[PDB]
Design a protein around this ligand. Sequence first.
Ligand SMILES: CC(C)Oc1cncnc1-c1ccc2c(c1)N[C@@H](Nc1cc([C@@H](C)N3CCN(C(=O)CC(F)(F)F)CC3)ccn1)N2
Length: 628
Amino acid sequence: AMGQSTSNHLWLLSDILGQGATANVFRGRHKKTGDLFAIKVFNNISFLRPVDVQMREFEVLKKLNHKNIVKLFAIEEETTTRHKVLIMEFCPCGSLYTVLEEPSNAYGLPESEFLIVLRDVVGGMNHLRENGIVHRDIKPGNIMRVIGEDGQSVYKLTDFGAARELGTEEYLHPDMYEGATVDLWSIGVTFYHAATGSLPFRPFEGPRRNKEVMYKIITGKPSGAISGVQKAENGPIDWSGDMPVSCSLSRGLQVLLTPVLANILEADQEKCWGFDQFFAETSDILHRMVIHVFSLQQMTAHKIYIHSYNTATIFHELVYKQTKIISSNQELIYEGRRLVLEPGRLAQHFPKTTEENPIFVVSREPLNTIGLIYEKISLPKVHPRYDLDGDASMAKAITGVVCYACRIASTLLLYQELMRKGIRWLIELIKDDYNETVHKKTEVVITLDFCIRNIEKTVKVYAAELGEISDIHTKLLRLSSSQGTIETSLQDIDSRLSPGGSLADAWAHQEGTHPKDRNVEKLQVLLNCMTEIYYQFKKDKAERRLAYNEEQIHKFDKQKLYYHATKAMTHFTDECVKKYEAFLNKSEEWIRKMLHLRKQLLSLTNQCFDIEEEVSKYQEYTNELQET
Ligand SMILES: CC(C)Oc1cncnc1-c1ccc2c(c1)N[C@@H](Nc1cc([C@@H](C)N3CCN(C(=O)CC(F)(F)F)CC3)ccn1)N2
């Protein structure tokens, strides 16, 4: 229907993207070119109208250009109203707030996506700081997303510098609710929200007329606690200086991210960081690369963040911080071959590793098997009330839980398939140690046997030495005999290394789950059915009221969403989880049987080397006879 216009651009007010206090932005096009731009039509601008200062202000912001900041192309005045309109580049993909509405990120964004936002936000925020311009109000609803040429998102800043001539309540700083840290506060709240999927400080009901408690939480924040939430009405505050279990981030990343947030989330400027320390420590985190490590004994995958110029000694040490294995017993395997790392080798030249093909870590010393430990979350109660707004929030919650369950279920299958290979490779590598012990033993055996005969023949070729010649002769059979006693014990190990030898991995090819089971794809089918219903309830919430037929289909759909969820989690716990714990139970035992075999065969190999010294002495010594 009706739609406003300008000299160069036009748009209909139906296509609405954002409703701000001073303005409204809609989806618009250029009057020749037809390209999309965001139209900021200023509403109620007369008592201001500083065509004096804002002219110069917006002209300055126009040429201000960077890849991580929304570009202001032009400022025009409307035809029908003489209103001033900023025309900016259109971000097709929404804001960070829109992505956090997605249930897949209800418990936090993917680790990779978190690094993109973090990198872009700081760089954009840093570009305005070099110009002195500073924001304070940075919020996911104010951080837009577009898709870059490489396909991965690029985040930009967009509605800053609007606080001089005339913070989100949840992202406000304690003293400003009623410098250096006051900047950094809303960003840390943003970063906690992108990693966890929820806000740091939460009263029980929430941000309403009982919001005085919230302010006490912020003002009562002890130490380097990054979060504080009361789980009951008017109850105590559960404080924590670490991140939750539902966090999709790797544990190695949390160790570096935690100090940043603890130091950038505190009201006192005495003990809190500046933009320089902040830019330094996070930029420190982004330049490090990731090397994927799977501890095969304990079944835990790891992401070690290292600078490319760091050595392999701190690498073993940092690995000790996550697997707690001392560097000298840590043994690496890669692409099924053992891997030798010099203590001073740089990380740039490490082999290329992924989570589906990492560097395995094995230890001779026993280690407990932990597995993936994630937080068990059940479904919430579905009320029969028709509150569409309530039905929408409940849809995001219940669908996000199954998203979490489906990611873990996808992680558990990865762990098993990874366990299965690392086990199959390990035995062929330890048998190579077995291929090598008889190996090196054959050098001793024929030299020894013939050596005894030369001494056993010289008695025929030719009282004093004859009595001991026999005695050395007894000892040479004492050792040829012991060469004979261990020889029997190594073929016994060979019977177990053989298929069906009580060490085979056939158990691993049976108990757990496989991609052939297709258990993860099955849950995404039901989970997709649920999200469209979710995005539909938002669409019904936007109407505020629905016609009759649609309200009853909405009541039909809201009930199938519960039935879908129960169907998936039941398939999750009764098939995927249980068959995983059974694969984990038989996993600790087989390593015990493998590490036991590795220590005995170990000894037999040194006993064979133990013996080599004895035949190296009799090799010479007695043939070492001196004579004119
Ligand atoms: C909101 C306030 C902070 O906004 C500003 C304030 N100050 C300065 N700049 C901005 C500013 C600048 C650039 C842009 C935005 C805001 N919003 C942004 N794009 C968009 C895209 C979207 C995404 C979900 N899709 C929605 C469907 N869809 C439409 O077209 C529907 C239609 F057809 F009905 F329109 C295509 C777009 C959402 C929100 N913003 N792009």
